[PDB]
């Protein structure tokens, strides 16, 4: 039964304290204006590295491999940025990081007001 | 908890039949034996500044507006006057008592000496340590890390 099945895979996680609202909000952010940081440094797109955290968060090749038999060439567009995004100093790598965890917190939020 | 810092360079007053003589004191390691309770003498005028350190004690010597002299009161050297109140020159600073150790939170680094008759200066570059506490709050997040060494005017939280 799919009904009581729902429920109970929403029921296994608890929910959420102002505290850990606050600071869900906050680093989702956080991460979201590295991406706006990063798009300044490279010199690409808002959306294209914010996809491709995804690409390396959200799964393996099992994200870009069925949006449909069309999105974005896995090995072409995605590959070449995300070793072009790899080699850069100790000043803009961080703001990686904050982004897969920015973006990764969005998720848990998700979750908890589900 | 953030533990601050905070330097100064002082002197000091206290016989030669007591000095136990160190470049360096740990925190309450024992300094100046002595014989009977030795008066702090001051060797200079001006008004006092008197800030209680734990055990020990510290006594800013300033005319007006700047510093004239800074005294450093081990444990259990007493102070004779209250902060603020205007002395003179030999005036009867503080009493020292038999063993006066180091403070318990304090170090001694690059010690000096100057030693006249049954009586010795020692000026001592005092460092320790005046923690504070801070109550953080859900409208806040810690930022630096766990016993992590902080700069002036740092953003902790």
């Given at each position: 039964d799919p009904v009581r099945q729902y429920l109970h895979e929403i029921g296994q996680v608890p929910l959420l304290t102002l505290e850990e609202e606050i600071?869900?909000?906050?680093?989702?952010?956080?991460?979201?204006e590295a991406i706006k940081?990063?798009?300044?440094?490279?010199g690409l797109d808002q959306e294209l590295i914010r996809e491709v955290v995804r690409a390396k968060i959200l799964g393996t090749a099992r994200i870009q491999k069925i949006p449909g038999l069309k999105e974005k060439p896995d090995p072409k567009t995605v590959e070449e940025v995300?070793?072009?995004l790899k080699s850069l100093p100790k000043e803009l790598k961080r703001y990686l990081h904050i982004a897969r965890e920015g973006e990764?917190?969005?998720?848990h939020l998700i979750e908890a007001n589900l | 908890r953030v533990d601050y810092l905070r330097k100064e360079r002082a002197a000091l007053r206290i016989p030669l039949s007591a000095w136990v003589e160190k470049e360096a004191y740990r925190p309450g390691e024992v300094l100046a034996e002595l014989s009977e309770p030795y008066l702090f003498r001051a060797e200079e005028s001006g008004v006092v500044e008197l800030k209680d350190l734990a055990?020990?004690?510290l006594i800013y010597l300033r005319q007006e507006e700047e510093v004239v002299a800074r005294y450093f009161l081990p444990a259990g050297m007493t102070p004779l006057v209250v902060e603020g109140?205007?002395?003179?020159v030999g005036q009867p600073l503080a009493e020292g008592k038999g063993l006066l150790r180091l403070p318990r939170h304090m170090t001694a680094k690059e010690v000096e000496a100057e030693e006249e008759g049954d009586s010795v200066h020692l000026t001592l570059f005092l460092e320790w340590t005046e923690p504070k506490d801070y109550k953080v709050?859900?409208?806040?997040?810690?930022?630096?890390?766990?016993?992590?060494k902080v700069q002036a005017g740092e953003k902790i939280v």
């Open positions: 600071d869900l909000a906050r680093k989702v952010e956080e991460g979201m940081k990063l798009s300044e440094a490279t995300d070793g072009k990764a917190a969005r998720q | 055990e020990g004690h109140e205007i002395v003179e709050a859900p409208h806040m997040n810690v930022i630096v890390p766990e016993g992590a």
